[PDB]
Amino acid sequence: NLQTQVTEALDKLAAKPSDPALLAAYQSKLSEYNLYRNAQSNTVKVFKDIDAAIIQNFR
């Protein structure tokens, strides 16, 4: 449910792009979603490659 409070903080900075506290919280949001998405991308990849290595070994 992380994408909900991702998609909930962009609109108040869109309606008011000059509050200093909001862009600090918005950047603090977006970099954490940046750290989450590539973590999920990097973690499914090893589970694919090691699953391909067994059939590469046994072929």
């Binding site: 999920q40 499914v44 589970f47 391909a52 059939i55 072929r59």
Partner: protein, 89 residues
């Protein structure tokens, strides 16, 4: 964008092992045809490939499509290899 599922998996009697294999082949060729056309319609719609959430979904459907047909390929290869050694004796 509005989906549907079917819940009945019917059963017809096999009259032989040959009658069994025709169902196992037709049941697997539909799944490998449909999943590749799913990933093509996912790609050819360009609004699906620009969103961050749907991309790991298409990554999952990729890695399952690769692992499925590779697992049926090596297994049928070792199966017919098991036939060849017995026939050579």
């Amino acid at each position: 964008i509005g989906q549907a599922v079917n819940i009945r998996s019917m059963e017809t009697d096999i009259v032989s092992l040959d009658d069994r294999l025709l169902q196992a082949f037709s049941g697997s060729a539909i799944a490998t045809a449909v999943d590749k056309q799913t990933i093509t319609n996912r790609i050819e719609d360009p609004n699906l490939v620009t969103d961050p959430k749907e991309l790991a979904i298409s990554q999952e459907m990729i890695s399952d499509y690769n692992l499925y047909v590779s697992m049926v390929s090596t297994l049928t290869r070792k199966g017919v290899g098991a036939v060849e050694t017995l026939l050579r004796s």
